[PDB]
Amino acid sequence: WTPVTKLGRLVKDGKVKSIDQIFEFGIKIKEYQIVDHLLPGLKEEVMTMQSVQKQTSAGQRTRLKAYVAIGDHNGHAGLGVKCAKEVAEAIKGAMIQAKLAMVPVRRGYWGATIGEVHTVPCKLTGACGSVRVRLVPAPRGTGIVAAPTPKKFLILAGIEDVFTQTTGHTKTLGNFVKATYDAVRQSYGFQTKDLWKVGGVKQSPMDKYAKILAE
Amino acid sequence: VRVNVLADALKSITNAEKQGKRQVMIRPASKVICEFLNVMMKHQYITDYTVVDTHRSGKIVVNLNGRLNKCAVISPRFNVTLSEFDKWEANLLPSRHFGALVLTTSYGILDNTEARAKHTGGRILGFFY
Amino acid sequence: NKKIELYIPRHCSVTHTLIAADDHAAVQILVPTVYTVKGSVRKDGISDHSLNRQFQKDGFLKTVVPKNMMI
Amino acid sequence: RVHIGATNLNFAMEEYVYERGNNNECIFNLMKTWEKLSLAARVIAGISNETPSDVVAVAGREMAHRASLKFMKYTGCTAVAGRFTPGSFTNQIQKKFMEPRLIIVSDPSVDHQALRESGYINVPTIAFCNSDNSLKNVDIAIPCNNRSRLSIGLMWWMLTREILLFLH
Amino acid sequence: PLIEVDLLNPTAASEAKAHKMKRLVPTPNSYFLEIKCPKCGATTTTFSHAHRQILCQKCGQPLGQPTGGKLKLTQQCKFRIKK
Amino acid sequence: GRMYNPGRGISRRCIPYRRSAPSWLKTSTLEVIDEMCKLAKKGIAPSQIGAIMRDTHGVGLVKSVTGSKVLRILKLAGLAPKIPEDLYFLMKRAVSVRKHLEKNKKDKDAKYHLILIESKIHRLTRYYKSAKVLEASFKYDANTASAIVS
RNA sequence: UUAAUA
RNA sequence: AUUGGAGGGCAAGUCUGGUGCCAGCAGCCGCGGUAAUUCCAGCUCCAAUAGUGUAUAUUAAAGUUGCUGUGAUUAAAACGCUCGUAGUUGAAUUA
RNA sequence: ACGAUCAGAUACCGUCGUAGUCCUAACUAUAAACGAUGUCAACCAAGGAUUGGAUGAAAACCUUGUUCAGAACUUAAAGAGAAAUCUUGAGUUUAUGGACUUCAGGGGGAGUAUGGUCACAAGGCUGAAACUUAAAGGAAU
Known part of the structure; x- marks a missing residue:
């Protein structure tokens, strides 16, 4: 409640009815409550609880770092990282960060347009640190052929079928999820053949409702 | 030394599109380079091209329109049997609807789709998404 | 049934490439028509010149871009 | 002397520069200065007609403070005179979280902080660029002199007139 | 270059600046000229970048000296470009 | 780049886009052939013969x-030298370096460059034998080249 | 100037 | 209805009795110095099931043998440098 | 070989001093022989300066415009990488293929033993195994 930004005000007034409108014009989300309004009932799943330490004169300062993945099972996903002194708060802090880090997931078919969309449209590669995760489209029957760490994330994004090939120090849990989030992130940035058409001209929600937000 | 002129040309085209350039220039022109461009035009990956005659294996200027993700040549042109097509596409192309290979066959230089229709194999030249 | 695409992405008016949902440097200039510039073009120091070509194409400018550059 | 630029010429302003002067100073094209200025003013007028507060004009250098402040008066667009706080466009919890839909900067070399933040908030920018200035993170550049007091006051006053005492 | 010009129709000035080989269609920067002799009226045609002493066909008021890239014609030798 | 050192220069000539004689040129082939014919009899390399005509x-x-090219013209008249011009000049330099090396035994840079020069000779001699220009009985020898090159 | 070890 | 296990890899007990850096467990990290989640037992449930553990070897994992497919500045790894035969690779061009 | 210092000092400090350091002829063929970055070729973001040319202007030297070759330097919100950093590449690589050669496979044992070969000799080139061990190592906080 109590929005601060324009997009926060617009969604509270119920003028931006779909999250896809925000993704259409590339508007940054700065309040996690915006995602709560537009994507209700998001499933949750905490990837890991890694504890870091900083050496001090009096000893060590242990903080808990939480990797949480959020996203509805219909093509949206988000990954957020937060570290703090308490496990309960760190999850809550990473809970917020996951919501502002929502990204669209473009998925397609394997060989024909029959049924609903199940798999990625082309080959995508995550570009984290030494870890690199490749996703390949797969037929209908095959599940998410992947390690448990990115399988948990890919389940949330709604990708039912995929083939994976990982490379690097995949034992690094944080980079393993980050690499998957990166391959998914650029799904809508890779221009395939069907996206050649420029389509029509659409009005930005911040310009059509610029007057009301001022008043 | 210049071993593969086609490799030089396709690297120039891919580099130009990553920088967003409008048109690019290729210094050595060949029949094979022209055929590869014609295949890419039929799929509307390049607007057009012109060939200038310098009496010295002249130059080619290619106009690009935001559509060629990557065109690359394939080193030694393997003898691709008709049964080895889908093995090559599964390796080199992103999906089953997006890209196209290029093969040199006795019926000319054709992509994988119409070479399959004409029922003929040959050496593989390259591909483009 | 349901539409297979989440949304139809915008096309940059300069490089004719898609505008990613995470591209937080991509702008939209309204000339009382819509112009979209990708974030990569802006950071390179060229978006000013690229818009000059597009502005001259649509008539908003006449004697800015020379003929040899008008492509 | 708005036409007279600096000595070193940026690669992005070569089109606007007409011919180097007698002692190796760049001389801008007057028609190109007006053509860019009229286009920029039209863009500002299009946005500012509904919501004046969404156009932000910043002016770091001291001889541009007064010119920008009157531009605030005669158009209603918010003007930033002193130093630009690094985060006033990105920190929403900050009490001075001002949101623009367009940014006007007196000098890219001095007001770089405002320009660089425009790459985080999806906001086009307009600048009064000199022949030496770097044309990064700007979208409409007005080739002019932005060091001498006369040119700074005139260009802002000319821009204010087209959107619809300035000298520092 | 980040800013790009047309690659099919280069300007007259732009082609002149470029190296003799890096033009659209490479052209030599040299030419053939004739030199009227200071001693007589005969005109001797010779290369612009001659690599030897240039003598008249009549006598030999030597008309030029080869100097590493272009003939060093005498100050009193007048020439025109053979088109 | 150059064959033997990392130097990389592009000093070339630029043939104009006009394969026919220029309009202002009026001398027919008869004068060109005989003028070239007289130069060949004087012991002038084909590369230098063309330069003299041009200048x-x-x-x-x-x-x-x-x-037709200069060498083709000279072959028809029979005035083409038996040893190809480029090979002949290479064996002229190998002889000259060797003569200097007889008195200056301690010169280690001349020994290196003589090795590079002789490797060039064996590259050209191999090529001209495949082109049937030189009979297979030809062979470059230090004790012999001093006389034929002279 | 000299200053080894746990 | 048995076989193996119940600290992590790896599903399963921060239950109770003895043992006290001993006996031992432990493929790896490791647990045990008297309050053991890992020893020896009792109860319970974890996996598979007429099968289930162990030991050696093949294959996958191993993009840690590379054609698809690796790495060579600093992690292991560009001959001190040049010439050079076999070998490998070789510009455009022919209705 | 003396004299100091020190617990001792066969060392650092001081004095003397042989082989050597220098030239000629012949061996040896190793270096942190380093840019720790093989050779050739294509594409490639902004600069300022410099070495040697060619070409206009300004009266060999110097100031400027263009262009070719060379050793470098600065900026990058971009590309790459584990990072340091690289940008005349260490870029154009899971969107993996321009041509060729050499080398590496956890740390030791070990460049050791043996065998072969070269050298007057010291040594050089090629070069293991048994056994032992969960780490050794790289960049950064």
């Missing part, structure tokens, strides 16, 4: 006037 007679390209 003095204004015949900058001979193929644009006669339709």
Whole structure:
């Protein structure tokens, strides 16, 4: 409640009815409550609880770092990282960060347009640190052929079928999820053949409702 | 030394599109380079091209329109049997609807789709998404 | 049934490439028509010149871009 | 002397520069200065007609403070005179979280902080660029002199007139 | 270059600046000229970048000296470009 | 780049886009052939023969006037030297370096460059034998080249 | 100037 | 209805009795110095099931043998440098 | 070989001093022989300066415009990488293929033993195994 930004005000007034409108014009989300309004009932799943330490004169300062993945099972996903002194708060802090880090997931078919969309449209590669995760489209029957760490994330994004090939120090849990989030992130940035058409001209929600937000 | 002129040309085209350039220039022109461009035009990956005659294996200027993700040549042109097509596409192309290979066959230089229709194999030249 | 695409992405008016949902440097200039510039073009120091070509194409400018550059 | 630029010429302003002067100073094209200025003013007028507060004009250098402040008066667009706080466009919890839909900067070399933040908030920018200035993170550049007091006051006053005492 | 010009129709000035080989269609920067002799009226045609002493066909008021890239014609030798 | 050192220069000549003789040129092939014929009898390399015609007679390209190259013209008249010009000049340098090396035994840079020069000779001799220019009985020898090159 | 070890 | 296990890899007990850096467990990290989640037992449930553990070897994992497919500045790894035969690779061009 | 210092000092400090350091002829063929970055070729973001040319202007030297070759330097929100950093590449690589050669496979044992070969000799080139061990190592906080 109590929005601060324009997009926060617009969604509270119920003028931006779909999250896809925000993704259409590339508007940054700065309040996690915006995602709560537009994507209700998001499933949750905490990837890991890694504890870091900083050496001090009096000893060590242990903080808990939480990797949480959020996203509805219909093509949206988000990954957020937060570290703090308490496990309960760190999850809550990473809970917020996951919501502002929502990204669209473009998925397609394997060989024909029959049924609903199940798999990625082309080959995508995550570009984290030494870890690199490749996703390949797969037929209908095959599940998410992947390690448990990115399988948990890919389940949330709604990708039912995929083939994976990982490379690097995949034992690094944080980079393993980050690499998957990166391959998914650029799904809508890779221009395939069907996206050649420029389509029509659409009005930005911040310009059509610029007057009301001022008043 | 210049071993593969086609490799030089396709690297120039891919580099130009990553920088967003409008048109690019290729210094050595060949029949094979022209055929590869014609295949890419039929799929509307390049607007057009012109060939200038310098009496010295002249130059080619290619106009690009935001559509060629990557065109690359394939080193030694393997003898691709008709049964080895889908093995090559599964390796080199992103999906089953997006890209196209290029093969040199006795019926000319054709992509994988119409070479399959004409029922003929040959050496593989390259591909483009 | 349901539409297979989440949304139809915008096309940059300069490089004719898609505008990613995470591209937080991509702008939209309204000339009382819509112009979209990708974030990569802006950071390179060229978006000013690229818009000059597009502005001259649509008539908003006449004697800015020379003929040899008008492509 | 708005036409007279600096000595070193940026690669992005070569089109606007007409011919180097007698002692190796760049001389801008007057028609190109007006053509860019009229286009920029039209863009500002299009946005500012509904919501004046969404156009932000910043002016770091001291001889541009007064010119920008009157531009605030005669158009209603918010003007930033002193130093630009690094985060006033990105920190929403900050009490001075001002949101623009367009940014006007007196000098890219001095007001770089405002320009660089425009790459985080999806906001086009307009600048009064000199022949030496770097044309990064700007979208409409007005080739002019932005060091001498006369040119700074005139260009802002000319821009204010087209959107619809300035000298520092 | 980040800013790009047309690659099919280069300007007259732009082609002149470029190296003799890096033009659209490479052209030599040299030419053939004739030199009227200071001693007589005969005109001797010779290369612009001659690599030897240039003598008249009549006598030999030597008309030029080869100097590493272009003939060093005498100050009193007048020439025109053979088109 | 150059064959033997990392130097990389592009100093070339630029043939004009006009394969025919220029309009202002009026000398026919008869004068061109005989003028070239007289130069060959004087013991002048084909590369230098064309330069003399270009500098003095204004015949900058001979193929644009006669339709055949200088070497082809000289072969028809039979005045082409038995040893190809480029190979001949290479064996002239190998002889000259060797003569200097007889008195200066301690010169270690001349020994290196003589090795590079002789490797060039064995590259050209191999090529000209495949082109049937030189009979297979030909062979470069230090004790022999001093006389034929002389 | 000299200053080894746990 | 048995076989193996119940600290992590790896599903399963921060239950109770003895043992006290001993006996031992432990493929790896490791647990045990008297309050053991890992020893020896009792109860319970974890996996598979007429099968289930162990030991050696093949294959996958191993993009840690590379054609698809690796790495060579600093992690292991560009001959001190040049010439050079076999070998490998070789510009455009022919209705 | 003396004299100091020190617990001792066969060392650092001081004095003397042989082989050597220098030239000629012949061996040896190793270096942190380093840019720790093989050779050739294509594409490639902004600059300022410099060495040697060619070409206009300004009266060999110097100031400027263009262009070719060379050793370098600065900026990058871009590309790459584990990072340091690289940008005349260490870029154009899971969107993996321009041509060729050499080398590496956890740390030791070990460049050791043996065998072969070269050298007057010291040594050089090629070069293991048994056994032992969960780490050794790289960049950064």
